[PDB]
């Protein structure tokens with residue numbers, strides 16, 4: 130894709146902190162950029178549509194390569210069009226703004242380069258307000274093994290780059306992306322039946338994904354997802370697997386992950402409105418990526434979680450599922466959880482924590498997003514899922530929401546002023562971001 134010129138692009142600023150020891154942090158002057166898929170795709174010369182609703186123009190985009198040459202990703206009016214604002218260390222993502230639904234943003238090191246985090250033997254903390262996230266919405270904060278430059282050095286027909294939010298990948302090998310690896314996704318494009326703005330193409334973009342935070346006011350989950358190749362790679366067709374393919378398990382990434390949602394793990398009183406972590410008020414989320422030998426070059430061995438609210442430091446609750454022990458993600462926990470829930474162990478098939486850790490070693494990009502779910506209504510996060518199962522069977526119940534909740538047309542109509550706000554990001558050695 131070309132770099133658009135119809136609407137100017139300016140990246141909202143966002144500060145964050147690097148800590149060297151508890152109480153000893155310094156400020157980084159970051160910025161964020163909107164993902165390419167949200168942008169108008171304009172023909173470079175006449176400023177007309179290359180993509181309208183969910184179909185491509187056949188003159189500008191007769192094939193994938195020609196389309197990338199003829200078409201540009203426009204700049205973004207962050208607040209007015211996308212409902213994205215920032216102030217200091219805080220980033221607020223609104224749900225519905227006009228016809229736009231949510232957003233996906235990446236943290237930048239500079240105007241052409243995503244910030245790379247090396248998570249092994251490190252800790253990441255942030256504050257969040259999920260109080261205005263009802264059933265069916267997901268405010269996600271997570272890491273993916275994207276290329277720092279958004280693909281530009283590998284793919285000459287990507288002239289837009291990280292400056293315009295190119296290069297996304299995740300463990301679903303997403304096929305909804307309009308541009309992957311310097312090519313449009315027009316050959317094989319199939320418009321969505323249920324989303325006026327989207328479709329699925331032949332190309333998908335795979336990479337490992339560390340889902341630090343997927344949450345609303347009802348439930349949250351923390352979930353690593355390994356891939357056979359840790360970093361960004363193209364897939365084609367149904368061999369992509371993931372949520373956009375016929376068989377989610379047909380590809381090279383684990384679409385399910387090894388998840389810890391305290392409600393799903395048998396403690397319904399821990400997280401939610403008025404609960405031990407009270408989602409009606411902001412709180413801090415700390416996540417630690419421990420290695421087997423406690424050094425930077427060890428193998429990822431354990432992912433730990435603490436919350437802080439009203440200055441009280443509260444560890445993740447223990448699993449209360451028979452057969453599944455502890456409050457952290459480890460190989461033993463993941464093996465046991467899949468067995469207890471009767472879920473396929475795709476996590477192990479794609480290399481588990483060893484492959485997750487290999488991705489971490491390559492470096493990962495911070496993503497902040499707000500979305501609703503045109504495949505499964507977020508029921509996997511906050512309801513009983515699958516919806517035909519007995520909700521008393523271990524693994525089925527994930528939150529309080531009814532199984533008819535989360536339909537996009539319902540939540541977009543009923544909760545347009547919902548939002549998520551992320552703030553006070555801190556990153557450093559273990560124990561450096563909070564009072565351990």
Ligand SMILES: *[C@@H]1O[C@H](CO)[C@@H](O[C@@H]2O[C@H](CO)[C@@H](O[C@@H]3O[C@H](CO)[C@@H](O)[C@H](O[C@H]4O[C@H](CO)[C@@H](O)[C@H](O)[C@@H]4O)[C@@H]3O)[C@H](O)[C@H]2NC(C)=O)[C@H](O)[C@H]1NC(C)=O
Pocket residue numbers: 396398399405443444445446447449
């Ligand atoms: C859902 O998860 C939450 C969070 O883990 C869990 O709440 C915890 O419950 C335990 C047990 O009631 C609490 O621990 C007790 O807390 C009191 C007050 O701080 C202490 O006095 C107790 O100390 C005695 O027992 C300890 C062993 O447990 C001994 O080591 C100690 O020497 C004392 O004899 C004990 O620590 C804990 O504080 C809460 N945590 C929070 C944040 O509320 C809850 O029980 C889970 N729910 C279900 C249904 O499983």
Ligand SMILES: OC[C@H]1O[C@@H](O[C@H]2[C@H](O)[C@@H](O)[C@H](O[C@H]3[C@H](O)[C@@H](O)[C@H](O[C@H]4[C@H](O)[C@@H](O)[C@H](O)O[C@@H]4CO)O[C@@H]3CO)O[C@@H]2CO)[C@H](O)[C@@H](O)[C@@H]1O
Pocket residue numbers: 166167168169170180182210228229230231232233269299303305306326327498499500501502503
């Ligand atoms: O097409 C130009 C048009 O764009 C409008 O914005 C649309 C995009 O067109 C559309 O591709 C985008 O689709 C979203 C989808 O709604 C989300 O459900 C999905 O969410 C992701 C999430 O971001 C990740 O964090 C999570 O891990 O996975 C889920 C599921 O994939 O993301 C896709 C994009 O990849 O939706 C946009 C918003 O409505 C603009 O509104 C308009 O101005 C433009 O003209």
Ligand SMILES: OC[C@H]1O[C@@H](O[C@H]2[C@H](O)[C@@H](O)[C@H](O)O[C@@H]2CO)[C@H](O)[C@@H](O)[C@@H]1O
Pocket residue numbers: 352372384385386388472505509510514524
């Ligand atoms: O595809 C929806 C959703 O699935 C999540 O994995 C589920 C899985 O689909 C289900 O079979 C299993 O029982 O539970 C896991 C964990 O909820 C995956 O983690 C999500 O990313 C994906 O969005």
Ligand SMILES: *[C@@H]1O[C@H](CO)[C@@H](O)[C@H](O)[C@H]1NC(C)=O
Pocket residue numbers: 559560565
């Ligand atoms: C972090 O602090 C915890 C709690 O005091 C302690 O158990 C742990 O050893 C600390 N980790 C390191 C690497 O110092």
